[PDB]
Amino acid sequence: NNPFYFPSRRFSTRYGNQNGRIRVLQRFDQRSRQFQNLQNHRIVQIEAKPNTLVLPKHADADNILVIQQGQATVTVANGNNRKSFNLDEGHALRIPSGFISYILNRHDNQNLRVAKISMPVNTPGQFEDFFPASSRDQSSYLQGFSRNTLEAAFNAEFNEIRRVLLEENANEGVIVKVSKEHVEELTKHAKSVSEEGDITNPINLREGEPDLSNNFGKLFEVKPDKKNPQLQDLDMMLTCVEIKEGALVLPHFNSKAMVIVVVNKGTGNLELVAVRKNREVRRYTARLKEGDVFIMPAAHPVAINASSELHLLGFGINAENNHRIFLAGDKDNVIDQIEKQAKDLAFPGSGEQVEKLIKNQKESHFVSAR
Amino acid sequence: NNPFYFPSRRFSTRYGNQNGRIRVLQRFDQRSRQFQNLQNHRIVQIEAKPNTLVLPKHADADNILVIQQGQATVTVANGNNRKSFNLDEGHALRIPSGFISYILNRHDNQNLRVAKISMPVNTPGQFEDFFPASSRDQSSYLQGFSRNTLEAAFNAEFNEIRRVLLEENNEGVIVKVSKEHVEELTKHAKSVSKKGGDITNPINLREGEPDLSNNFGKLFEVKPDKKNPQLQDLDMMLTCVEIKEGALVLPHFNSKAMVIVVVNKGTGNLELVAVRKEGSNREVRRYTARLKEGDVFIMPAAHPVAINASSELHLLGFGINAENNHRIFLAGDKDNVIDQIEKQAKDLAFPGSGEQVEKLIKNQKESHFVSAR
């Protein structure tokens, strides 16, 4: 009924067992053709129990992962290097396609929640995970090669190769339980957020001062610019918005960015306004819950009311030179920038009346829903 | 019958009243699949009566507008800034998606004609205009929000909000403006003559010296390069060609740019040559059209084109995939690629000898544009 809204139910789990699960949202362009531009963006949500490890793999997709909740140790490896990072909530990490990575929940009793945006390299909207080891969920890709090839490659008997690499490990699946001793082994090397062979360092989305901030909300944003060259390559921005309970983000829009937003935490109500076929204004609404996804098309006015402390994670594509533009309040209010005489000709009220009404809201960006 | 030709009839009007109209060309890829690469480019033509104003709005499309005829005052506003520009014929202005703009015909008695290329951001080939105010043509998008949201947002009673912002002001989206209002809207208008929050200055397409020029024609071109960084972002070039009455642009093509051209003024005849399969044996196909003001046509890359002017012909060209494009000619002295073929190669390829081919080629002493006699 609301094509911009993707409830957690629209996620299907790809890997899942007692230790956690890897869920993947449906392709956006399958929902509606108005998301064709988002066709090559898939949202992944990973949940892992304490002292749990997502086994090594690579995908034929480029990735940015962000910690929604908890604490992780994420490792990235290419042909000649490995780096392990301790990631906290609101930290992001780029994982280039074809690099191996694995994810440790390094917490004793808190669950790990991770959000990923995957951008397939080969087939628009489609990617696969490639595990070097076998498990009950999937075989090692090494099994795809012949006996002769494997033996020549590893310089060893097929029976040894099969015994140590190819068999199913002693079977949980791709997310396994890890002993305290093993956990400490895996975190000894990790470094915390605060380059080499395209293994780039983690980004702290909440680094420094928020772009927008008052008593009712904060918006943090990491833009595609000199400070983050890799975001330039992707033409993406990463945004973290926190809306206090009982507060509202004023009607606003991104001028050119299209944003996929996931609800990291909290509840609230989405209003999204659109013009469609002489021309009618359509209102779309949704009750936001943790794990939900929604799409903010560029230049479509949006307002969001927080039922409880609301944490939203935004992946913005087509982000270069984006402006986040407001329709009420003092700062960033584009309606205010219309010339007085133009306001007078456009609106029912006089220019004076329009300009007065506009000055009623003394605050900017976020205000109380009261 | 000619898929490259789009007569003014193929425009449908989206907004229209006594004061003018906003017309939009059909999606190019709906005509034919050979225009799939142009799918995200829509042509808009705006006509406005004197002392008339196209009301504030933004689109979910990136825009370049060009004055085809008359004089305008165009205002662009974002979240923290506003700039107003006096634009004359042949002046272009970039309006980023989501920025508000409005268009004043500041002339007392001459109509304003404006051409726009719109490139949708969300849905390939589709965009919508978003008006903050209501009118008989459309509701304010502010009406899409709830009473509670509006009241909290504006810090005011819904009744006041509805009274001053939400009600219908009626005329439509293009309204009549009093002389006094007109003078108010033009009072701080800039006349930028050269480049100077992503509110970029107007471009003069006829700035400086034309690329090509003789007694029969001129071609002006603004290329995607350091001088116009925004054209680099778009990988686009803007071209203005003026062909004298009774003159002909020589057979030629763009090496890699695809060009959407609109006929700003005049009449003429288009010849476009494509190679098409009837695998096996393929044939040369000739496409023609009688060009009239307001017509659009597509110049696919590397397809030879010639244009004969029935009367002073002004053509506006929006070139995509423009970087490192070469406009290459098939006759005449300068830019003639056939001339660059080695003499021995000419001899082997053509029916005549190398000497005969080279002599025939030297007959045309002129370049680019010649008399249709």
Added chain:
Amino acid sequence: RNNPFYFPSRRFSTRYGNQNGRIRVLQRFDQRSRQFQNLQNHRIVQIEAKPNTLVLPKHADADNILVIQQGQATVTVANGNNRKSFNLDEGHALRIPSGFISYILNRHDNQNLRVAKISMPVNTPGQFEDFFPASSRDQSSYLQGFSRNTLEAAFNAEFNEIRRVLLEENNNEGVIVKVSKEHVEELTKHAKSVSEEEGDITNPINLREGEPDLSNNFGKLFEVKPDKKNPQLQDLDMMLTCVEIKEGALVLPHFNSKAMVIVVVNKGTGNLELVAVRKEQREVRRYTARLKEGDVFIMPAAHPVAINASSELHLLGFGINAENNHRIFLAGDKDNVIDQIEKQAKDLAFPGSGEQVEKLIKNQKESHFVSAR
């Protein structure tokens, strides 16, 4: 069609062909399978020409990189104001921008010429046409597409002279013609061998220039990457790769991290193993093919691949999405990513202990290429 990544020479269809040679074009990749949609705008052309033979002047509405697979050529590139002729040997590559005229001389007395081309259409995804200025039994001159009046005004001559020297069929063989020894020497007299660039006529690239990236007794891999040294490869975001695998040797399981590669077999025979993870009809799928000269296959990014040479195997690779690509190995010493997994992670992932995994991995002391025995 059992292995969608493999394209045997039979899947090429000849577009132009006669006694002197033939121009063959591979089917569109996305018509085979939708997993090749990203390769939709890349067509593979294979040209074969007899000794002292010339492929007649033409341009395409496609961008092109050509590479000499075998023999020796003189290739000429012409735009509106310039011409350059290049002597190209095996493993030399040349960029031919769309809309530029080019022709290809087999300058050898008795060896055949084989040329591979990657064409990227400008107008219509996956589709392009060749535009010949001259007529032949295979195609008419595009100049015939223009009217008598236009031609006469353009060339400043009688239509009868124009038709006689330019438009008639040059008894006609086709687009590949025989050339006399004297004509051949005429065409090679100004050819350069592998100077400052000029009007986007860029110089030839030697794929085997300098030192190979990977090299040992069993194989070599040469690569030209999109970087400052080859600005035009940057524009294309492409890499060009030349791999030579000794008879009886194997390229270790490996993959490109992000590049998608179209590879053509220039010479030799071998066996392809390509591993894909896929959804059950999650399972590992093995694809194989017997490689022969003229075959094409697709290496999707991040899909493990191993290749066994039945005889000296020369592979030419066109890599798209190439920037920051890493060629990553799954066995051997250097570039082995499995080796980079932490010991404790190896232990948790694999059936063996970390120590056992790390020992087994050190068995193969060599890198990249090893003996198939």
